[PDB]
């Protein structure tokens, strides 16, 4: 499909999309567990991260948005994790990815800055990180509502 990830197309430079959906996330996985999981192989390679929590059902939504700074970092993540089991909470689910319909850190910021999710516990809010320079990967304060 239009959102399937093909590592060879990324390597050859014919698909430069950077926003990816991390799929089949176990119900009880947290955003901290996801950040740590990604940091095993991809620390400092992404500049947007969000795993939405459903507070009523005590679970995450099952997928996360991640914006990689360089499209090549999708190969690093994918080749290490895609097709492997999460191996937490006795889940049978496997890590998988596809491209998101929304593309880029700026579009992601604009999608959540005015959202009601910014009113929840600061620890569970979407995150942005420095995209370039010596501090690349360091968390940045999320921009305030545009209204």
């Amino acid at each position: 499909d239009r959102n399937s990830v093909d590592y060879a197309q990324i390597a050859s430079g014919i698909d430069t999309r950077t926003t990816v959906m991390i799929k089949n996330i176990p119900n009880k996985f947290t955003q901290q567990m996801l950040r740590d999981y990604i940091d095993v192989t991809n620390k400092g390679t992404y500049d947007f991260l969000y795993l939405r929590i459903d507070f009523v059902n005590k679970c995450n939504v099952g997928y996360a948005f991640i914006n990689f700074i360089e499209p090549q970092s999708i190969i690093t993540f994918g080749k290490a994790r895609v097709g492997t089991q999460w191996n937490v909470f006795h889940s049978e689910k496997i890590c998988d990815i596809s491209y998101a319909n929304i593309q880029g850190k700026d579009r992601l910021i604009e999608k959540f800055r005015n959202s009601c999710v910014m009113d929840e516990n600061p620890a569970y809010r979407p995150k942005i990180f420095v995209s370039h320079g010596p501090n690349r990967g360091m968390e940045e304060p999320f921009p305030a509502p545009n209204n």
Side-chain angles (χ1 to χ4, degrees):
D1 92 293
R2 104 194 94 104
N3 292 330
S4 65
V5 178
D6 179 334
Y7 310 131
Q9 290 181 46
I10 302 173
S12 70
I14 63 161
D15 199 319
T16 62
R17 289 182 280 182
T18 55
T19 312
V20 146
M21 300 312 272
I22 290 158
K23 310 193 289 173
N24 320 311
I25 299 182
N27 294 343
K28 294 292 185 188
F29 218 70
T30 69
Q31 184 169 263
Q32 181 65 56
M33 285 171 84
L34 186 56
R35 188 176 178 180
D36 291 340
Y37 178 95
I38 298 160
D39 287 354
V40 175
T41 62
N42 277 84
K43 194 181 184 77
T45 70
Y46 58 99
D47 57 11
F48 185 95
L49 183 63
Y50 187 37
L51 174 59
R52 186 167 179 162
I53 305 311
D54 177 345
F55 292 92
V56 183
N57 290 285
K58 295 161 164 179
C59 67
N60 63 70
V61 295
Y63 65 88
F65 289 95
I66 183 162
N67 189 66
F68 289 99
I69 299 157
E70 303 292 347
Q72 287 73 19
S73 296
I74 300 160
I75 306 167
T76 306
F77 184 73
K79 290 209 169 177
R81 300 302 205 163
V82 171
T84 74
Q85 279 189 112
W86 295 99
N87 199 41
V88 286
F89 313 116
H90 296 119
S91 175
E92 296 197 342
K93 292 171 184 170
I94 75 146
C95 174
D96 197 10
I97 62 172
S98 64
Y99 289 110
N101 290 305
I102 175 152
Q103 286 295 320
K105 182 191 190 177
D106 292 339
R107 279 200 278 255
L108 292 162
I109 285 163
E110 296 356 284
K111 176 176 167 58
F112 298 101
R113 72 190 295 171
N114 306 304
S115 172
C116 192
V117 303
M118 299 309 295
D119 296 320
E120 266 292 337
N121 188 328
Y124 312 134
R125 294 182 191 176
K127 289 182 187 297
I128 54 160
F129 309 86
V130 177
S131 316
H132 300 295
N135 300 335
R136 170 170 54 83
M138 178 172 80
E139 195 190 340
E140 281 169 325
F142 210 94
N146 246 358
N147 306 143

